[PDB]
Design a binder for these strands. Sequence first.
RNA 1: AGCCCUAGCACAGGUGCUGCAUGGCCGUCGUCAGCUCGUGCCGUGAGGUGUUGGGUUAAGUCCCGCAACGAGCGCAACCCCCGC
Length: 234
Amino acid sequence: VKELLEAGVHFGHERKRWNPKFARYIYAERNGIHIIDLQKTMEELERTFRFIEDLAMRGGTILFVGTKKQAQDIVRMEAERAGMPYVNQRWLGGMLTNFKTISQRVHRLEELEALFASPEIEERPKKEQVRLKHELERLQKYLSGFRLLKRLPDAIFVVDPTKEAIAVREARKLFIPVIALADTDSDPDLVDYIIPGNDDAIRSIQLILSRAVDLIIQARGGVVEPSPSYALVQ
RNA sequence: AGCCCUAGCACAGGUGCUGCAUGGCCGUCGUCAGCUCGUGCCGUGAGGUGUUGGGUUAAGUCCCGCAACGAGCGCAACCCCCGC
Ligand SMILES: [Mg+2]
C-alpha cells in the first residue's frame, strides 16, 4: 500500500544545500523549499525493489548502513527483522576494503564470548574483568550487525549517501552495488539503485526502509506485522 | 718409546701501529614518550594517514572523536628491598 503513503509526510526535502545532479528528480521549488517528484520515486522504486527481490530470492546478502540521527535505531531493527547485517554507530576505514583485517575484530570479539561463558565467568587477575570485559564494549557497540557478515556483501543499502559516502566509495571500489535512499543533499550518479526521497524524515526513513524488508523475507515466505519500528515516533 | 741436553728447521713471542678495518662491552641525548610495521585509504612521487585533534596522565596512560583497523620495539606490569 504505497502511492499516498509517500506524500503522507515524506515527499520533498532541503533547500539550496543542493546537488544540481539531482535536478531531474524534482517537482519544484515552491515556498523556497525543494519538493521532489513522487511519480519518479515510484518509477525508481520498482527498479530498485526488483533488484532487491532477485538478490534476495537468489539468497544474497544486503549490508545495511545508517549512522545518522534519525536512522540509527530503525536500522538495527529492520536489519534483523530481515536477519541481514548492518553498520550503525561508526562506518570504519575499510569495513569492505580492509575486510579481512577489520574481520579479526569479530574473530576476537567472540573469543571473549568464549570467556563470558567459561571457567573464567568469575576469575582472571581481576583488573582484566574490566580491561577485557570493557574492551568487549567497543566490540559490542560497533560490530553488532557486522559480526554476522562473513564474506563481502552482495549489495549495500545506504540511508543518506552523502552522509555516508566513505562507504559508497568502497562499495564501488569492489563493484558491490549500492542501493541508497537519496535526496537533494546527494549525487545520484554513484548510487547504483536510487530511492529518491527524504533522507531525514523518520516517517520517511521508516515507511521505505521497512517496506524493502517486506520483500527481503516475502522472497522466502512468512511475512510479519507492521514490525517493531516506531521508536518514539512523535 | 718417553723425557730431557746441545746443532739445526718449521715456528713461537711482541701492552709494537691502526677504536677511522672490527667483535664484545661501556658512556651519551635519556628512563626523555617516543621510534616503527602489517594491511587498507590519500598522493604522479618523496611521502601522508594511523602517531593529528578535544579531555587526561608521570608517560603514544587512558578516554571521547576521526579513512582507518590492528600489531611490534618503548611506558606500565611480571623480579629485588622497605613499610602492616
Ligand atoms: Mg601534492
